[PDB]
Amino acid sequence: DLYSRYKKLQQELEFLEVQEEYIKDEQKNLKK
Amino acid sequence: STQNRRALDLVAAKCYYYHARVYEFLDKLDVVRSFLHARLRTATLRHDADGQATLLNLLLRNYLHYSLYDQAEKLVSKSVFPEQANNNEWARYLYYT
Amino acid sequence: AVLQAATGMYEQLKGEWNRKSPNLSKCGEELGRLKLVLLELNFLPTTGTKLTKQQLILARDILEIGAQWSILRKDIPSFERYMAQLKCYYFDYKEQLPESAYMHQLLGLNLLFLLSQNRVAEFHTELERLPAKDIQTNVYIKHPVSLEQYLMEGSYNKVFLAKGNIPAESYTFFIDILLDTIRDEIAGCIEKAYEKILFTEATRILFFNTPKKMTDYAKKRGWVLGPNNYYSFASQQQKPEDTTIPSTELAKQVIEYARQLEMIV
Amino acid sequence: MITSAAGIISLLDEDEPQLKEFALHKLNAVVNDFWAEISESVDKIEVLYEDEGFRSRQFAALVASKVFYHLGAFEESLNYALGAGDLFNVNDNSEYVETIIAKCIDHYTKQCVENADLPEGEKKPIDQRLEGIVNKMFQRCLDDHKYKQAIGIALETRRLDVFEKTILESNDVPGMLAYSLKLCMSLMQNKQFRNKVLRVLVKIYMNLEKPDFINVCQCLIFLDDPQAVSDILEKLVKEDNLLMAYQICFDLYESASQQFLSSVIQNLRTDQTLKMIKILSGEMAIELHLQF
Amino acid sequence: GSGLRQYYLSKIEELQLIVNDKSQNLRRLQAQRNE
Amino acid sequence: RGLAVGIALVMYGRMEEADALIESLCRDKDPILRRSGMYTVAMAYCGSGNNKAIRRLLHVAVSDVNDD
Description:
The structure is cut from a larger assembly and holds one copy of chain A, one copy of chain B, one copy of chain C, two copies of chain D and one copy of chain E.
Chain A: H1 2-31
Chain B: H1 8-26, H2 31-45, H3 49-65, H4 69-78, H5 87-96
Helix pairs in contact in B: 1-3, 2-3, 3-4, 3-5
Chain C: H1 2-18, H2 24-40, H3 53-70, H4 76-91, H5 103-116, H6 120-127, H7 132-137, H8 139-153, H9 156-161, H10 172-193, E1 196-198, H11 202-205, H12 212-221, E2 230-232, H13 247-262
Antiparallel strand pairs in C: 1-2
């Protein structure tokens, strides 16, 4: 189950990066 | 050293500070250098910020106890101090540097 | 077996070198072959425990002789190597090894050599290895540190006088290496401090014996001699150049202020 | 003791190879403690490995790797570990050995991933020593009966040979196959390499003692191969295994595109085959669904 | 008798540290955005 | 409005093969064609979890002149 956990962690990291980029964009437009 | 837990590192650093300290009263500080270097490497490879900072401070203190300023200069030149380190360890690192 | 043969072999080198006119080539070959013998007999032991002290002592004496012989033919790398080994045999195994009589002299030689190569940062680090007592007490250590103080503070006359009162004859060679710098340093002051100096006036300043020795050094320095025996050093006209406004740098700094005020969000 | 390696380093620039070899054999005993000062003589300790005529050049590499392993420059560390060769015994339990093994595995994975999508003409040949140590690491999991970890590394390294060998050699072939299929469907995203994994999975499935044709049909739906599914169905009809073929037809209509089923119909045409065309057309499937 | 189990653990913990850091940073950014 | 769904359906489940279309539709001045680009991102990445498409969808969601 080690590989499944490692791949899930990788996907979670990439999803977190996507979420942070979207949050920054939303702040940029929410100011406007 | 046998264990590989994550929170133990937060305890582990303190152990090292006392592990050297007992030898400070033994006035050897030389047998401890190999152990300090090995644990510094094992903490750096593990991204253990607190343990790495404590071990770096202990190694610097050991080097300065014997006026080995060249060795400490090299060690601070190549090693990278953890940015997210304790203030009480940042003070020692800044003093030694 | 090997230890006794190595001791006799070192005795051969000691007898050859202690002669008033040692043979540099023979001593060099002898030292080169002695190193090969030493490799087998735990040369530079790692974490030296209570092993045979005879090997440590023998290696220390051989390295001392080799270091003192490296300056005899006036070469840098051999002295560097022999001093690098001698420091390890001086400070590391000093618990079992006795205090070498020639240790302080050779350490002062190393410090003076570091001064000769302008590696003052290494000079202070190596000086800190000595105890704080013999720095101000032992003559072999007192002379190089005092020379460093004179060089840093600008007492160049004392720097030249340091040749006369050297602690040992071995200190001679490195002294000359320093002296060539001092002259080129002294003139560096003369150009920027003295606006105009007499030709003979620099004789004591530049520490030149022959007036002819002024001419070649001057044309090397490109000093415009004047008709009145005055060297005109008019070169301060190359000021910090406040005539030019560093508008690019100032604009960059102000733009960085604007960034730190606006880019935060 | 030996608080300084300045003398040992000074034993590097001599003209006698014995002096350099002994200095190398003295440094590796203190590379774990005095790597900081040897970091500035890395050039002089690597020039020995550069020279071909040096006896301990491989050793000159190994010690250099150790210094880099202590310096954090893992790329040069693994390069010099490769240069050392047989002296880098992977069976050792030292931290340096396993750290360099991890860095080597990561570098090999990156190179293999880059080469997988690269054209065959531009495929950069991987260093032979890197492949050798990676294969030794694969054999390590094979001997330790850690089949799942080897499967994961094989998937990451895009090496289907080790993937198939680990699947077959494992004691639980069906369980490992199910785990591999779940990993290939849930984690893999390269599609084309996912298709390659499905191809080798189908190869393994066809060679089983009792072929689980259902998983083969599912992987072939994923692969979009009407010819293979039609061939499997027709040999199932010829083999008299009509029940499994009926189940295959129902699964085919349930979870496959209409164009795929139309191509399967064309392949099937080229009694029982009429029933197969009937099920694949689907009309009875909606018959039971509507009746229910 | 473990193979790359230590390698897997090292990779997992290396990703876990970054995941925790990014999760905390994302929570802070989400608080700012929500405000 | 009909063609917006239609163009998306033409490229259903095509993974990155629709990218050349998507960047064309997402950059169009017509709001309905941008909506078609969103639908095409949905159809060409059905259940793939492709975080590139998710990133594009979120960027359009938080920054677009048209509410539709």
